[PDB]
Amino acid sequence: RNMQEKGVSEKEILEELKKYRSLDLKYEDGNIFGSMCSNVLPITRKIVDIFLETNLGDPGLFKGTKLLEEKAVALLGSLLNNKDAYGHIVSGGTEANLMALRCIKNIWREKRRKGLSKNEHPKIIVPITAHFSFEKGREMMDLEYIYAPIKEDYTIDEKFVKDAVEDYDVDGIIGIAGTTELGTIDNIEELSKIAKENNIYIHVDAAFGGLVIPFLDDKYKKKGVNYKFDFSLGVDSITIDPHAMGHCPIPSGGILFKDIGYKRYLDVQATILGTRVGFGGACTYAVLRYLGREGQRKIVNECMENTLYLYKKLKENNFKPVIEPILNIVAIEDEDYKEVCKKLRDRGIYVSVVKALRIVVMPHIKREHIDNFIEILNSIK
Amino acid sequence: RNMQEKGVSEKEILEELKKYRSLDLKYEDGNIFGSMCSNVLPITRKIVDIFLETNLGDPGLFKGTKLLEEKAVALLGSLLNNKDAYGHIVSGGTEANLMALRCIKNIWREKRRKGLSKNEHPKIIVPITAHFSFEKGREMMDLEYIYAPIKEDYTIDEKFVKDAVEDYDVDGIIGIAGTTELGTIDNIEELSKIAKENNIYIHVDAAFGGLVIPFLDDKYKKKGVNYKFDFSLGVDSITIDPHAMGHCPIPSGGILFKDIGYKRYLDVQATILGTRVGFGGACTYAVLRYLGREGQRKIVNECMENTLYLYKKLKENNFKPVIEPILNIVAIEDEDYKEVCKKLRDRGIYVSVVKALRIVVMPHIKREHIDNFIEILNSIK
Ligand SMILES: Cc1ncc(COP(=O)(O)O)c(C=O)c1O
Ligand SMILES: Cc1ncc(COP(=O)(O)O)c(C=O)c1O
Ligand SMILES: [N+]
Ligand SMILES: [N+]
């Protein structure tokens, strides 16, 4: 516990660390059911080693690692239908969302300096399903949120947004492509039309869904759900995280803006962090190149196959999924959800907690794990 | 540049990445003279591999990695004379400073809710030598800074601070233990007395110096410079970064608060980031344990030996250091500093840019590199 005068040997400290690591869960062990992280693609371990001693906070010293960040951003942009995107491979979806909020706020500041806004703080429409990073941004940056309600399918009420934009002077709209709790997809196409018609910035949070939705086989797509979310809709920015469904090591988050014109509104380097990893960009570029669309499609639809297997097994055992799954996320309605979560923990099953248990069917979740999960859950009931 | 349907082999993508890495500089090659990062302790590469698939954003899944973060914080706290510190191993000094600012701001908010502050925004005294992360915080969080001037020795003017605290209602004071440009140490002892006597929060930015100052041999300490900066002075928080002079891989920053009572003012998890590495805490704990005070002392004073060698060689060659060095940082006065920096770049010497060139004598800078540097600089002149 205290700092010591004398050092210890490598063998002593590594065996201590391994003892602590043995207290952790591991993704591959059939314990973790409620996380949007998973095992990294094995090749990334080598890449992390190669790029460990780089720093994208000083890109003039690491020109190649900086180029690889630009290439990673370009590949994500291509996936999102935008060959001119301006962006960064940042620390995660939180920093990405915070940077989009900073941009929204600085567009507002410029208006305020010209007398073109009656808002004393940026006014941003945010669905109540938004990830907590949006609350961190509100709290830090003194934003005013207009919380948008959700419809029966748990997607943002587009008519509310349109009415609010008519009633109020609005500085930004947030839409979510893959909500944290349920994996639902807001109607970005309609939100983007509202935004374009009213000259309002729109940010899409695709932290999770951005690397799932473009790869979904048709049999997993649902009638009447719109899967369009990217720059083909003319949106201003998109968060999309390789360390979620991109199989990249933390920290690998992504923020893309429609073009380089947005960079000036990130002025105070454009990232929140200063000193920052170079291996995230290298891993993001390398994994997307190594897999190609074919390899990512295979992984995404394997997860969707296991998601629909879990959904089927749940109904067969008389459990009530909140919704038919859209992405590789299923939630189980339960009034005793807190106690059931604890009882599951006691038996080696870690879900997250909507009066529901959330299951994220990442690539580490296999059929045998779902079978084991159902068996344990029945026993609890 | 575009996303492709077909993937590529591991050999193809690794050889592409290695070609980009070959465009980077490497710390050990005698090129990088102006960075506060350096080579990591080799043992950390193994630790990164062991802890790569952990996430301190979900510490209930990684109990051992979470304990190692707590142990890392405790070892830093012990080094800083505080066995009860509450803190986190975060992404860097920027996030650490931003968290201290959030705490300052939320203490102010509570006062505002009670009518105990006439300030419409937190008012914080910040020396003009402060790192740019403080500007990021100001810009995001709408802080009001009272910029404190520096004295002839480039440390904060304590009389200005005292006068300002008498004149104004002040919500926070920043002092720097190891300035970014010159490595100077503010008079934290006096600033802490002012702060305590007036019930003002004081944050110490020891991002760089926190892992240098406690290890300085007496022959490097200068008469009349006060080296006291830590919790023995009763300060409220300290930033201290293992990925600077702790030889830990990015991301390994540190933020410590005086006790657990500060955690409530970080409420909106207490970090800015969500999903976040677990290997920083493991590396921080392991490196401090592996080295002990003896091993870190050896490294710090080796750097100081090379710093004073560089200082001596500069004067012998008629160059004008800005100051006699305090930490392992020397700056060279030069009116043509921009052009000289570019000419140095062209010859393989990368310094940073006070009309001066900044040299940070990290552990990768050896005597032969300083000799080579002086030779090249003379030739330019
Ligand atoms: C929709 C969404 N956005 C953003 C985030 C934040 O991502 P991170 O934890 O990488 O900061 C989350 C994390 O899962 C999320 O679900
Ligand atoms: C004094 C000081 N504080 C904070 C920082 C920010 O640290 P980071 O780049 O790790 O965010 C710097 C970086 O060197 C610094 O010099
Ligand atoms: N998680
Ligand atoms: N640097």
Curated annotation (Swiss-Prot), chains A, B:
Keyword check for Lyase: yes
GO molecular-function term, one example from the UniProt record: tyrosine decarboxylase activity
UniProt temperature dependence: Thermostable. Retains full tyrosine decarboxylase activity after heating at 100 degrees Celsius for 10 minutes and 42% of its activity after 10 minutes at 110 degrees Celsius. Inactive after 10 minutes at 121 degrees Celsius.
pH dependence of function: Optimum pH is 7.5-8.5 for tyrosine decarboxylase activity.
EC number(s) on file: 4.1.1.11, 4.1.1.25
Family affiliation: Belongs to the group II decarboxylase family. MfnA subfamily.
Activity regulation (record text): Inhibited by hydroxylamine and O-methylhydroxylamine.
Subunit structure: Homodimer.
Needed co-factor(s): pyridoxal 5'-phosphate
Catalytic activity: L-tyrosine + H(+) = tyramine + CO2; L-aspartate + H(+) = beta-alanine + CO2
Modified residues (N6-(pyridoxal phosphate)lysine): A244
Originating species: Methanocaldococcus jannaschii (strain ATCC 43067 / DSM 2661 / JAL-1 / JCM 10045 / NBRC 100440)
Gene Ontology biological process: carboxylic acid metabolic process; coenzyme A biosynthetic process; methanofuran biosynthetic process
Protein name according to UniProt: L-tyrosine/L-aspartate decarboxylase
UniProt xrefs under NCBIfam families: tyr_de_CO2_Arch
Job of this protein: Catalyzes the decarboxylation of L-tyrosine to produce tyramine for methanofuran biosynthesis. Can also catalyze the decarboxylation of L-aspartate to produce beta-alanine for coenzyme A (CoA) biosynthesis.
Pathway: Cofactor biosynthesis; methanofuran biosynthesis; Cofactor biosynthesis; coenzyme A biosynthesis
Class of enzymatic activity (EC top level): lyase
SUPFAM superfamilies xrefs: PLP-dependent transferases (SSF53383)
Record's keyword terms, sorted: Decarboxylase, Lyase, Pyridoxal phosphate
Gene3D superfamilies (UniProt xref): Aspartate Aminotransferase, domain 1 (3.90.1150.10), Type I PLP-dependent aspartate aminotransferase-like (Major domain) (3.40.640.10)
Pfam families per the UniProt record, alphabetical: Pyridoxal_deC
